[model samples]
Target: KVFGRCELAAAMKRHGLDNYRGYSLGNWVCAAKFESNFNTQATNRNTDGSTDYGILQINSRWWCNDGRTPGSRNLCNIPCSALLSSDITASVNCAKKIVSDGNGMNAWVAWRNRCKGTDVQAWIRGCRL
Candidate 1:
């Protein structure tokens, strides 16, 4: 897991997410903080039987293959395990794809509920990025 918010912001900036597709770095950082607390290995099972995977908490019913969620679109074309790694390149890339598809940050319920319209500047506060 990342040690602090500054570290997380630096990592996101290294991944070129500072202003990806019009969304600010604060938006991504706030969403990740809410979704998985910057833990790459985080996962949660939903009542609907679909599981959320990795830092972004992407749903298995739509994005990645978890081998249990039948009929998953796998639009990201990645295994859920990949998202659980320390390297978040795949996860960020998939997130970019999702946003590019017009969902914006709305695709992530955590973002819509917690990060949206909030003062997210603190997410990147003190970061050199």
Candidate 2:
């Protein structure tokens, strides 16, 4: 499932990602855009051979268990398939857990390079926040 920028923003806001951990809603929107382009089924394999899954692209290396990432901590206590699902319930929940664990948005290299220090407002420009 692919989401438009505003639609995704609103959804994340509803799930409590907004203003969580002192991070603005825009930061969440911005990261999601570059992380997975708002596609629920998106997946990226890292050089370590672990995969990032779903809209916010939770990592299999430490957060989720794909049953393939060796010694996965499964810190998020979820399977990668849930992160890849369209419902997004687990994705949003797991993301909060990730941030709370101090990984910050930098857990996503895409966010570090693309969203950090950017004018995040553009990510939710038209959303009636």
Candidate 3:
């Protein structure tokens, strides 16, 4: 499942990412500033420059081109499809699983702390998640 900016923002908010509404909005804007500079079309490659993908920078092989729906440019070129799936809840749940592993999201949180000057707890409440 892929998600657009709106869908991703909403899901993040739901998951306790944004709490203060406006602050949440600002936080998301800022976090994205650090994440992908708010570029919906942003993509990155490994230092080896092998794997490259969009916005949230999803890995192509794990999604799109080789997944359930193959040979779709929209799915391949658009990483949103991987994060904000048709099933928003499922997408978020998957994020929760990753976060539960104590690896994901923390990097984003650290970046937010540095960029927004707010701690993770404050940002969590700001997003109302």
Candidate 4:
């Protein structure tokens, strides 16, 4: 796991995530909390047979290659395993690409279902950023 709430906020801020691509830092923080509880090694298997990888839970169908899964778009040009690391640089970069593609945080079901339309200030509360 990479961070607790405050620590994660600090890291995200240091990475200039506060308003990257116009998405709020709170949205990213809340989504990260719910998606993987800040665990970079997190992975979830979807009912559709694709797996979600990393703290962002990026799907294998389009973002990264798991090798067993064929036809991955691999738009990030990285192995899915690369996202399962303590260092979140690669995952953050890929996530930026995803948001830039116009899906915004809606690409994450967790964000759409859990973080959206909800009070998310607590996700960054007590963080100096």
- Index of the highest-TM-score prediction: 2
Pairs of colliding residues, candidate 4: none
User: Which digits, one per residue and each the tens of the lDDT, describe model 3 over residues 44-89?
Assistant: 6445333433334444443334233333333234343454334434
Candidate 1 global CA lDDT score: 0.87
**Alpha carbon deviation, residue 84, candidate 1 (Å):** 0.4
In model 4, where do residues sit more than 4 Å from their true spots?
A: none
lDDT of 4 by residue, 17-129 (tens): 78888877898899999999998999999887789988889988899989866666799999999889888887888998898888788898899999988877778877887
Q: Could you give candidate 2's per-residue lDDT for residues 35-126 as a string of tens digits?
A: 88899999989899999999988899888999999876898899899997778889999999888887788877888999889899888887
TM-score for every candidate vs. truth? Answer: 0.94, 0.95, 0.40, 0.93
Per lDDT, the best of the predicted structures is: 2
Q: Which 10-residue span in candidate 1 carries the lowest summed lDDT?
A: 1-10
lDDT of 4 at 75: 92
Give the Å shift of residue 90 in candidate 4.
0.6
List the candidates ranked by lDDT, beginning with the highest: 2, 1, 4, 3
Model-by-model lDDT, in order?
A: 0.87, 0.88, 0.44, 0.86
